[PDB]
Amino acid sequence: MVHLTLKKIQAPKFSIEHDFSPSDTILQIKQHLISEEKASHISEIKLLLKGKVLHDNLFLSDLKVTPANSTITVMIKPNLEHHHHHH
């Protein structure tokens, strides 16, 4: 039911999708993007639903992301410190 397609149009940009149960939190989704190295920290990930700023630990039962509004804008900016990238 609670279907969230996280489209990242920031840097280096990408498009992902996730499915979680309503009692899960934005923070868990964030921790997930961290754990899959798609981001640095929970807050460095901005999840927006219909232009609405979702908070770090917002519960999905309060969001109620309907399949009809499943398009999520995810603004993530990873730690581009250029250590491994710079040789």
UniProtKB/Swiss-Prot annotation:
One of its GO terms (cellular component) is cytosol. Its main location: cytoplasm. Keywords: Cytoplasm, Nucleus. It comes from the Eukaryota. Coiled coil: none annotated. Residues 2-79 form the Ubiquitin-like domain. It is found in: Cytoplasm, Cytosol; Nucleus. One of its GO terms (molecular function) is protein-macromolecule adaptor activity. The keyword Nucleus applies. The keyword Oxidoreductase does not apply. One of its GO terms (biological process) is post-translational protein targeting to endoplasmic reticulum membrane. Present with 6510 molecules/cell in log phase SD medium. Required for efficient mating. Involved in the production of alpha-factor, the KAR9 and TUB1 location to the shmoo tip and nuclear migration into pheromone-induced shmoos. Interacts with GET4. This is Ubiquitin-like protein MDY2. It comes from Saccharomyces cerevisiae (strain ATCC 204508 / S288c) (Baker's yeast).
